[PDB]
Amino acid sequence: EKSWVEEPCESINEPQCPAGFETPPTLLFSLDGFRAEYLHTWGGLLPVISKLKKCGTYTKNMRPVYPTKAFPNHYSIVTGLYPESHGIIDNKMYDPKMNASFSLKSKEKFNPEWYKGEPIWVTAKYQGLKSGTFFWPGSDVEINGIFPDIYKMYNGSVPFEERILAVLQWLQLPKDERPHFYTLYLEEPDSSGHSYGPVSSEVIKALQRVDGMVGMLMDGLKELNLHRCLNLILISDHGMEQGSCKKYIYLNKYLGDVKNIKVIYGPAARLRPSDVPDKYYSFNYEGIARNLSCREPNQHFKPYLKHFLPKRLHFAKSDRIEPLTFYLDPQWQLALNPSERKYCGSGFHGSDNVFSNMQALFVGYGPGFKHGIEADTFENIEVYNLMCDLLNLTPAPNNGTHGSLNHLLKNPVYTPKHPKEVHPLVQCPFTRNPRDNLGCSCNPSILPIEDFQTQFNLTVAEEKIIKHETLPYGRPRVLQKENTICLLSQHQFMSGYSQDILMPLWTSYTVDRNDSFSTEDFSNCLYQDFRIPLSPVHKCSFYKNNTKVSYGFLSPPQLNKNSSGIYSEALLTTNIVPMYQSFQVIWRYFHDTLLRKYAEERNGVNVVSGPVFDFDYDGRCDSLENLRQKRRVIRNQEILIPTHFFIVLTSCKDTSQTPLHCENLDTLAFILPHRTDNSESCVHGKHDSSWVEELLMLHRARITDVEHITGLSFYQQRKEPVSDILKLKTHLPTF
């Protein structure tokens, strides 16, 4: 029989397998440290992998999870959960409740208490299947009192060919106990990458030899007549970056030669007190955080409290993360002193999981995968569900949206459906009330409202045209069980007002290319709204000469669609959110420059925005009971200050069509933090043009993150199938 690589490409429309393989088995083959740039550049030197890419599913980049290391990425693929949820946050970590440390070279690696979640072999055992695992992280640990059917304790002295032959011999096991799920792991090209760097000759040799191993496996598969039955997933966990010895940062220069702290070095450095667990909580982290706050111009690191990191990282829920963290620029690392660190002139990984050099590999082959296709970028945390659809299993709950990755399968198993609203929207009717005085003195150039009833009473055609113009994709729905909201309609912006918290939840509007922005002043001018009862928070007196709080407008009054002045109805009482003094700079700069720039460049944008409340830094919206206690008190009144602000922008893919009639959608979402000061960006003698844009750049997110953190559901009226909508919502903006 000739080598499998020499055969012409074919198609597998129906699997033919011996008895016992009604559902074809799945193989999970991993190459440590193999980054996507390797296949981008040296593909001509790798025949087998290139052929596998040509005759199967392929993606240019697969995004790992933060931190970008071995166990987090190798255990999130099988569990499907974020590192903050399945426990293993890094190769080195400390648990104070256990008062223990986790390490690769110690005996604590096999302690079952370190592992949480639920792997895939556990599910297979529960639902009547057998699995043979060969050197997968976490497989040789008694998780939930269950072992895989066949497993091997890790040992790095075993040659690769013995592993491959053992897998084949398991494949020739009789059907009585034949496994249905296999894995296989190799240590290269990671070791050569560390020793010699991403760009060298030893890495080329390692790539060619692992390709030879893959070809050996494929030839063994073909010799057994299983080359058209098995499902193959060629995967990788991270990438590699070249570290220099002149690109380190030492904390002894700033923090002195102190000897009561410990630092976890690398591109994901962290700080911990030395006295544990007694001083784990009583320690003063904020002092050190403010100590190193941009002590030098353009320093290539940034301190961060673990609850102030960007929400796209998901690195704050667990208690094994130290309350302080350092965000490092590309190619840079951090340490305390030159003694407490590893070598400097070698390759490294572990940086932010959005850098171009940290992306992984994903290739699919077999009857269940499409042929000669190329998909977009997706996270590894969604492979789990895919595997569950390749073995006919019901997945355990995880952090992947089922059906999002459904276009990679010939015959989809699961059909996603849109979530339904819990309760119908209440209505806020007009009620006669006395004309109270709010004590506000503003510019007389603003035209006051004469009759509230007259202008806000509209014929059904008016509401129809306003709904068409302002909500092209339909109103967002609410999934919270106990939350009473009413829909407020205006001339060019639509709002959802919540009676429970006394604040708008979402405001939606559209900005056209020809729309103009005014520049007049509109301060300390508030117009009362009769549709809701008055509140002492809704007066200018509360915000008059206050150094703690302030107010902002969700719908920008600078935008008028009919006149060159300012919009009067945007100054209503029901369009006010509490805001800090410093955040107003970012808000005003955005609404004044960036909105206009986006509208001009993209030919109109549909904008919907609001506040989000999350005091648990867990990624999910707080309940009413939890939200009740967290409200602050000031001036003998009770307020509830937002934690972050979300804004999302929608337009057409092609610039020749207005957002009202988009054939395809292009979306951009941001979740910005609400901080008292701007010490995060370290503005000092710097023009305002750049830092606000950079802050908006760093804090991007996906629509799924916004849905999780708000409890809202978007785009429920589009004619596209639910799978396409789920795929679009999971897309994370790239620049």
Epitope: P159, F160, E187, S191, H194
Partner: nanobody, 123 residues
Framework: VQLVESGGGLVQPGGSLRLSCAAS?????????IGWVRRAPGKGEELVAR????????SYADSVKGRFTISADISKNTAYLQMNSLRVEDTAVYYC????????????????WGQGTLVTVSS
């Protein structure tokens, strides 16, 4: 890639030496083993000590058991071999050796050799 040895010389019996081996071009942490090999006239290659830089486990010859001490500094990529209470036959030339991984069978047992330092003991 190269390995350099330092600390050699001539000492009276009962003295103490601390040979140092510095490697460049690769990483000590990501190496299978780091060892010392001594050669004396009338004798062939002999393994006296070897260490695993990551695990820290050490392997010693019977002739030097209880007399030598091997260690590794990772932040500086160095291997240290301290020898005390030297004997008359301990005079020899020493090499710093790096072993290869057993991942591929068609590979040599060792990969690289150092320049080697000559040590003599006399009254």
């Amino acid at each position: 890639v190269q390995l350099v040895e330092s600390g050699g010389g001539l000492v009276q019996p009962g003295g103490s030496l601390r040979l140092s081996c510095a490697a460049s071009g690769f990483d000590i942490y990501y190496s299978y083993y780091i060892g010392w090999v001594r050669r004396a006239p009338g004798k062939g290659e002999e393994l006296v000590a070897r260490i695993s830089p990551s695990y820290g486990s050490t392997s010693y010859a019977d002739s030097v058991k209880g007399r030598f001490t091997i260690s590794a500094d990772i932040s500086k990529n160095t291997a240290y071999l301290q020898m005390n209470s030297l004997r008359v036959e301990d005079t020899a030339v020493y090499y710093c050796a790096r072993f290869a991984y057993p991942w591929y069978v068609a590979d040599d047992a060792l990969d690289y050799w150092g320049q080697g330092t000559l040590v003599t003991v006399s009254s």
